[PDB]
């Protein structure tokens, strides 16, 4: 084993390493957009409380919380790191597999060639 | 008028004071709380305080309403909020409307509207 | 969204009337920094208060603060 | 102060040369609303109060029950 | 605005870009800097042509 | 030169635990010894056994650390808060940090099993 | 424990642990079946996973031993035991 | 919804939604003026 | 010893772990009538809004401006 | 430093004013800093001598950037 | 056949005949685009993706250019970079200035690809001005600005060729094109709104997110799509408490980038008619109440009604976890019972093909299976209102391949030509085993799709018997590289609840139940319910149930939970929370637990990890997530369960009716979103907007 436990010298709770859920993943490749820039980055974001996430005030309509992680996503250049880090801290995590586009091939000549038989659909462009 | 609490009791509070607004009565959106349900959940400090004297501005909604529909000669019309009275831009980014269908078309920023002359 | 800075680090400076003023920067790519660290002259100032004021009188320690005036919004950083 | 009307308040602080009386007519901005000058009531019963303008984003149901027929 | 700049025929970006121009932040290892001692640079070469020289290099990397 | 301050040991990372033990009981008697300055300094509202109980409580929660670096950064850092409170830069609120027991109870339901955690929504 | 109600049998498809038991499921499930008319009677397979069955007798009292043996006999008379050792 | 990112201080609150007239516009607009900071970047930022 | 962070502060502030807002927060209590610290609870919630982070690469590649005198030969071809 | 990064140019106006600026800055520095050494030393007089001509200096600040003390005038670029 | 070129310096090897732009991105090579999406068809009208190959003269387009051995490619040098400015100088011509209202600013490429490939300032001063255009009405669901389009023609293509919907076309010619249906029509398709996520621009937007949020403020989200038994990956945007939008999320082997639009469009069910607070009934009213009230009223009416063995019914309906399943059927056993039960019509006995065996109630050959299909079946279903995404997959495998199908059920508007052939058991068994057979037999990867509505019919055991003999029969459907043989459930629920049991016992199957615990079930029909039964609702929506119900109490939806929903081939996925649950609403099988404390029993496990190590005690393939994976034990799956026990079953002659009557208001959250309410009046076959006289 022999992975130091730095959650001991960190100077933060311990709920987080009791309690707290995280999840390690590659953010999805946005189907509104189709850049990848966002991608290649394996952040790190806790898991919700749900008593404590987000309750409207009365006072004017803001939104508050108790939870001090909502907001802290860290950054990281690889898988291993981003585990090898937690478990220094003693966080317990979920890893989430990206998904990749497969490749097949694609031709524009696919678009104009023979039917044979009945056209099964007519194309516009 | 007179609004029920929840805890049971009842909340008087007069008509000019209820309205969403000095020209409009009916609120101008799903999510818009109406007046009555403001009070009713907010009496508590509102209780000692002078209804008379807290802001109540006049909606858009209906004084766009009362502006006459413009009109033009083609397809197009361009729309630019400018003052013409002093420097600068001063309005909203030029915005060409098509206005070939029957009715009237309004500008997405200002509620302005325009026709095809009929 | 801003500006997105090319990925680098700098430390750059300049004679800001208290002294050496200086800013470290880090950038990522990104629109948003990584670190900034200000570097704040009242800071090495006051540090060397202890040597400074060694051997002198509570008055003269007042115009010692004073030769550097502090600012200490800029010393806390 | 808060009882200055505006316009002075900006003649008041030398902001410009002419006066709110004398300025002209197309520097002068056009209201479809009526004027209603009203200063800083703080202190007194006519403190603005805050509220939300918004109603309670999740809305609940409002029972009604059924017969096993 | 300054005339170059303002110039609205033979003024394209791709010039006057000067962020996408930017000087890369340049790394040397004790590596790097033997082949320039072994070998030389390209201002100075002592270095053997062919794929001779390319092991040369490599057998330092 | 800039002269250290009243209690301050230089930092010194010890390569054997034989060592840091000798280090860490020294911190303990002097927190021990001192815990009577803790009660006159602080306006405190309760005993100096109290005081010796919590320091052997928070004594007890790093005792069972095995790896040599962690346990030179916990001895640092206990020695930066026995020359914080020692002389006299920390106040009531930061030094009473350390006894939350000692005010009274808060409140009535403390939930322990499950059902009234359930009932607060703290499952 | 007045009657068995549910079998659960969980099994490797390609393992070393699961052959055996994979043999016991293919020839004896309907005759399992027949001499247990009541019984939901559950295979559920995953890979790496040690071959293991479980029984529910009643008001959700499970038993269970694993099923890491040599042949399918072991596997009919060890079922067997834990279904009679209620 | 620009003032509401370039604020420095998040002060600003905003919720809209289309208007009975089809329209896009308000109905929650929000200054804590304990979070202001007087910067200006938000009378820049409005295209209107 | 600390220098900015409170007499009792634990934690490290600057550390990519540590949350903007810290853990604690500090408020008079009339009954103990003492400064007392007690877990965070924000009336209004930190929105980030590095989410609308660019999706596209925004400043490619570089220049190169390493003298010559620095750089690794090429071999001559043959 | 951002524009260190940026690898950008400001144009000769923008300098001047900066520079100028600057200046007009530090004299609104050493005008506090002298003056409150003084004060501390027990000379109250100097200070509202010269805290009138940061005054002064004070409405140029508000013409060019809005605010009288903190103002944002120099960005990046 | 791999080759091999250069780009920008850097080798890299791919297909013969691919596209230039696939070998970049494998090369990492970031080059621009607007009319290129990876699963539609090519086009070349963007003009954007010009790079330079010393080939041929001309800059060339990347999108279309086939790749070729030894070929050179850069797209750094001037030429390109010019290019790239002139393009974006010409589209944002004539683009109006409406990024502040426009329901994409910070999501648009145009902007960032402006940003990044063009010019800080445009030369179009000109007075004659931008031209306009005139916004089209193509429905609720769609909302158009129609001065934004580019032209890219994503939309034309997707209608046309992933969905069948070709009422969408370009009409016009040069400057006054216009992509519209031609004259006032509506985009019938259940596909409409992946439009929305094709188009760049925000010249088709979602309507009821209009204008609500800008994306910087959301905070994204990667959970799973409950309304079908697909599990289709999305991303949700929240805004705090409230649930703005849903998205897409890439999965090659179930969704590839689409959702239906029921899964889009039912999110505004999770803020209207919700359960925040439980209720008791005390006559006609409902009466606010606490937990600890409802709860020992449970126990109460347990202790006094005295149920035993099987008098306990529990119901799990569409729209649930596996966690809360495993902690119903836990304490129903607890109290001595076994009549856990669906909501499904026939539910109160079990299924005709058995849980024994997953093989006998999954898609086994995977959803990416039928891209390698010969030949098709459908019985008893309509595959455009169960999983409407394999339709889609349906319909590009037979548009690219050589594909026949044939159906077995009510005639069906499919997107795709289907050969209807029968709507009973009697043409189903002279299909099988006249023409159709053979050629079920002569294929290599044939399917055998059979509908849950026929596991909903008291004659499913003559059905599955039929189809088992075939099967085993017949080698090509069923061998040890295939399995042909499949079953398309409609909810997300009936897998999960299958692979834990969750089927009513015969005992039990007649037994007139005293008290009825239902959960998330709104089918229900006032006659599977008595009178004089305590009943007991759990969900997070009252739409049907609760009105029977004496207690109410409430749950978490989709959203506010990180259940475990097992899909149609078996892969179980794992959600995310985005928000807490409302009000005074609980985690469901937290409520059990509690409710299980109160009565005379417990269950054995208090926090999540402990509900996971469970889950692996009841099926270890419920924490595979992700992972689908085959099986050994086909051959016996059918000769144990479909054949054996169903030959003493006789087939009637009621023909085969529609599962599903309505896509939308389908289930719970979907009747309480009043854009499905729009959307069921629209979107229908009567109306004349939907249907194109041909
Ligand atoms: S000027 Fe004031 S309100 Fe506007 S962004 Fe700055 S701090 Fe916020
Ligand atoms: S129009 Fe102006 S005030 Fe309104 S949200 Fe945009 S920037 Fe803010
Ligand atoms: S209508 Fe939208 S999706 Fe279709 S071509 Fe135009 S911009 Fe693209
Ligand atoms: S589509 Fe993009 S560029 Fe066009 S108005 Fe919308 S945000 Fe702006
Ligand atoms: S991406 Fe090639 S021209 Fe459109
Ligand atoms: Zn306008």
Redesign the interface.
């Known amino acids: 084993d022999n992975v130091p436990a730095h959650e001991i010298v960190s100077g933060a709770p311990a709920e987080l390493s009791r309690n707290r859920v995280v999840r390690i993943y590659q953010q999805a490749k946005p189907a509104t957009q189709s850049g990848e820039y966002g991608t290649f980055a394996w952040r790190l974001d806790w898991d919700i409380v749900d008593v404590a996430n987000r309750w409207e005030n009365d006072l004017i309509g803001w939104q508050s919380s108790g939870d001090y992680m909502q907001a802290t996503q860290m950054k990281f250049t690889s898988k291993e790191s981003a585990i090898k880090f937690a478990n220094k801290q003693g966080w317990d995590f979920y890893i989430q597999e990206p998904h990749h586009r497969k490749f097949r091939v694609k031709q524009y000549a696919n678009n104009f060639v023979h039917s044979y038989g009945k056209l099964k659909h007519i194309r516009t462009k | 008028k007179s609004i029920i609490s929840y805890n049971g009791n009842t909340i008087e509070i007069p008509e000019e004071y209820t309205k969403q607004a000095p020209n409009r009565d009916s609120t101008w959106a799903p999510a818009q709380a109406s007046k009555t349900e403001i009070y009713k959940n907010n009496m508590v400090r509102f209780e000692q305080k002078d209804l008379s004297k807290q802001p109540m501005p006049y909606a858009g909604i209906e004084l766009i309403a009362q502006q006459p529909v413009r009109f033009v000669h083609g397809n197009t019309a361009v729309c630019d909020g400018a003052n013409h009275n002093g420097p600068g831009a001063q309005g909203h980014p030029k915005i060409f409307i098509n206005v070939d269908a029957p009715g009237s078309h309004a500008c997405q920023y200002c509620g302005t509207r325009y026709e095809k002359e009929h | 969204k801003g500006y997105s800075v090319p990925p680098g680090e700098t430390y750059t400076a300049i004679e800001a009337p208290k002294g050496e003023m200086g800013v470290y920067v880090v950038s990522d790519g990104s629109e948003r920094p990584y670190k900034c660290k200000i570097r704040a002259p009242g800071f090495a100032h006051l540090g060397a208060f202890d040597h400074i004021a060694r051997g002198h009188f509570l008055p003269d320690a007042v115009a010692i603060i004073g030769t550097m005036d502090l600012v200490f919004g800029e010393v806390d950083r | 102060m808060s009882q200055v009307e505006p316009g002075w308040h900006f003649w008041l602080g030398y902001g410009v040369d002419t006066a709110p009386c004398n300025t002209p007519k197309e520097k002068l901005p056009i209201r479809a609303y009526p004027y209603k000058f009203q200063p800083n009531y703080t202190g007194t019963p006519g403190a603005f109060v805050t509220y939300n303008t918004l109603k309670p984003k999740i809305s609940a149901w409002e029972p009604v029950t059924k017969q096993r027929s | 605005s300054s005339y170059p700049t303002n110039d609205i025929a033979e003024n394209p970006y791709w010039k006057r870009d000067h962020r996408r121009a930017y000087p890369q932040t340049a790394f040397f290892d004790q590596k790097t800097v033997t082949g320039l001692l072994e070998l030389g640079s390209e201002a100075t070469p002592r270095i053997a042509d062919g794929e001779a020289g390319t092991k040369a290099l490599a057998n330092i990397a | 030169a800039i002269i250290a301050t009243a209690f301050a040991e230089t930092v010194k990372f010890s390569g054997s635990k034989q060592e840091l033990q000798k280090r860490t009981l020294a911190l303990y008697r002097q927190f021990l010894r001192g815990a009577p300055t803790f009660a006159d300094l602080y306006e405190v509202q309760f005993s100096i056994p109290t005081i010796r109980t919590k320091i052997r409580q928070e004594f007890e929660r790093h005792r069972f650390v095995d790896d040599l670096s962690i346990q030179n950064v916990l001895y640092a850092k206990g020695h930066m808060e026995y020359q914080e409170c020692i002389n006299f830069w920390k106040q009531q609120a930061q030094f009473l940090k350390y006894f939350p027991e000692e005010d009274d109870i808060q409140g009535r339901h403390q939930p322990s099993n499950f059902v009234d955690k359930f009932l607060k929504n703290r499952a | 424990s007045a009657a068995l109600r549910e079998i659960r049998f969980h099994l490797c498809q390609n393992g070393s642990s699961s052959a055996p038991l994979r043999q016991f499921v293919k020839n004896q499930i309907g005759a399992f079946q027949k001499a247990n008319p009541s019984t939901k009677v559950l295979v559920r397979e995953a890979n790496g996973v040690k071959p293991i069955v479980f029984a529910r007798f009643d008001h959700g009292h499970e038993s269970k031993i694993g099923l890491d043996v040599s042949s399918e006999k072991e596997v009919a008379e060890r079922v067997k035991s834990l279904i009679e050792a209620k | 919804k620009l003032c509401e990112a370039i604020c420095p201080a998040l002060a600003i609150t905003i919720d809209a939604e289309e208007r009975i007239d089809g329209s896009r516009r308000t109905t929650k607009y929000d200054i804590d003026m304990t979070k202001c900071i007087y910067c200006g970047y938000c009378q820049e930022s409005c295209p209107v | 010893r600390r220098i900015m962070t409170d007499y009792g502060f634990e934690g490290h502030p600057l550390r990519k772990d540590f949350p903007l807002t810290g853990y604690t927060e500090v408020r008079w209590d009339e009954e103990k009538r003492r400064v007392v610290y007690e877990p965070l609870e924000l009336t209004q919630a930190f929105r980030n809004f590095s989410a609308g982070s660019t999706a596209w690469e925004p400043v490619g590649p570089g220049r190169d401006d390493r003298p010559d005198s620095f750089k690794l030969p090429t071999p001559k071809p043959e | 430093?951002?524009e260190?990064?940026?690898?950008?140019?400001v144009?000769l106006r923008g300098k001047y004013i900066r520079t100028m600026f600057g200046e007009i800055?530090?004299v609104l520095?050493?005008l506090?800093?002298?003056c409150?050494?003084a004060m501390?030393?027990g000379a109250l007089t100097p200070f509202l001598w010269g805290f009138e001509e940061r005054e002064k200096l004070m409405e140029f600040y508000e013409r060019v950037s809005?605010?009288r003390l903190?103002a944002?005038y120099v960005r990046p670029g | 056949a791999e080759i091999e070129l250069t780009i920008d310096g850097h080798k890299v090897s791919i297909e013969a005949g691919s596209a230039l732009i696939q070998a970049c991105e494998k090369a990492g090579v970031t080059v621009p685009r607007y009319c290129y999406h990876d699963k539609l068809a090519i086009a070349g009208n963007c003009r954007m993706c010009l790079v330079d190959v010393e080939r041929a003269p001309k800059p060339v387009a990347s999108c279309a250019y086939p790749v070729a051995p030894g070929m050179v490619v850069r797209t750094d040098t001037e030429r390109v970079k010019q290019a790239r400015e002139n393009v974006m100088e010409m589209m944002l011509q004539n683009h109006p200035l409406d990024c502040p209202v426009c329901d994409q600013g910070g999501e648009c490429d145009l902007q960032d690809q402006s940003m990044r490939y063009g010019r800080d300032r445009g030369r179009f001063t000109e007075i004659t001005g931008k031209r306009s255009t005139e916004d089209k009405n193509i429905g609720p669901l769609v909302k158009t600005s129609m001065n934004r389009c580019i032209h890219c023609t994503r939309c034309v293509r997707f209608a046309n060729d992933i969905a069948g919907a070709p009422e969408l076309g370009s009409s016009g010619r040069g400057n006054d094109m216009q992509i519209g249906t031609y004259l006032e029509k509506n985009l019938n398709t259940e596909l409409s709104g992946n439009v929305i996520d094709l188009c760049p621009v925000g010249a088709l937007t979602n309507k009821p997110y209009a204008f609500r949020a800008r994306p910087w403020e959301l905070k994204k989200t990667e959970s799973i799509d409950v309304m079908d038994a697909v599990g289709s990956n999305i991303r949700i945007d929240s805004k705090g408490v409230e649930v703005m939008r849903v998205i897409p999320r890439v999965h090659e082997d179930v969704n590839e980038e689409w959702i239906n639009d029921k899964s889009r469009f039912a999110c505004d069910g999770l803020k209207t008619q919700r359960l925040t607070t439980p209720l008791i009934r005390v006559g006609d009213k409902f009466v606010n109440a606490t937990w600890d009230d409802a709860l020992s009223t449970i126990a109460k009416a347990y202790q006094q009604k005295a149920p035993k063995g099987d008098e306990f019914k529990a119901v799990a309906g569409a729209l649930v976890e596996v966690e809360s399943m495993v902690a119903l059927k836990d304490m129903t056993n607890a109290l001595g019972s076994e009549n856990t039960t669906t909501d499904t019509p026939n539910g109160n006995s079990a299924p005709a093909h058995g849980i024994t065996f997953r093989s006998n109630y999954l898609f086994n050959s995977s959803i990416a299976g039928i891209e390698d299909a010969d030949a098709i079946l459908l019985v008893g279903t309509n595959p455009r209102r169960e999983a409407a995404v394999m339709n889609a997959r349906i319909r590009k495998a037979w548009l690219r391949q050589e594909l026949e199908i044939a159906s077995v059920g009510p005639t069906l508007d499919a997107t795709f030509d289907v050969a209807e052939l029968g709507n009973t058991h009697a043409d189903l068994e002279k299909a099988l085993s006249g023409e159709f057979g053979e050629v079920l037999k002569n294929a290599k990867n044939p399917l055998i799709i059979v509908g849950s509505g026929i596991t909903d019919r008291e004659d499913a055991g003559a059905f599955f018997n039929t189809i088992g003999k075939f099967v085993e029969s017949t080698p090509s459907v069923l061998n040890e590289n295939w399995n042909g043989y499949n079953v398309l459930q409609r909810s997300a629920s009936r897998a999960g609840a299958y692979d834990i049991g969750f089927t009513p016992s015969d005992e039990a199957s007649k037994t007139t139940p005293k008290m009825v615990w239902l959960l998330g079930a709104d089918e229900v029909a006032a006659s599977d319910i008595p009178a004089d039964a305590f009943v007991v609702y759990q969900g997070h929506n009252g739409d049907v149930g609760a009105q029977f119900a004496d207690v109410v109490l409430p749950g978490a939806a989709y959203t506010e939970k990180a259940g475990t929903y097992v899909n149609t081939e078996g892969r179980s996925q794992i959600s995310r929370a985005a928000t807490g649950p409302p009000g005074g609403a609980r985690e469901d099988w937290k409520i059990l637990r509690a409710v299980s404390e109160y009565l005379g029993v417990a269950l054995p496990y208090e926090d999540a990890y402990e509900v996971r190590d469970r889950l692996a005690e009841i099926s270890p393939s419920l924490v595979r997530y992700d992972l689908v994976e085959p099986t050994v034990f086909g051959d016996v799956a059918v000769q144990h369960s479909l054949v054996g026990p169903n030959g003493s079953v006789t087939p009637s002659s009621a023909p085969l009716t529609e599962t599903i009557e309505n896509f939308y208001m389908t289930d719970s959250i979907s009747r309480s979103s009043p854009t499905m309410a729009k959307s069921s009046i629209a979107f229908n076959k009567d109306n004349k907007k939907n249907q194109a006289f041909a």
């Open positions: 430093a951002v260190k990064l940026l690898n950008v140019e144009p800055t530090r520095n050493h506090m800093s002298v409150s050494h501390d030393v809005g605010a903190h944002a």
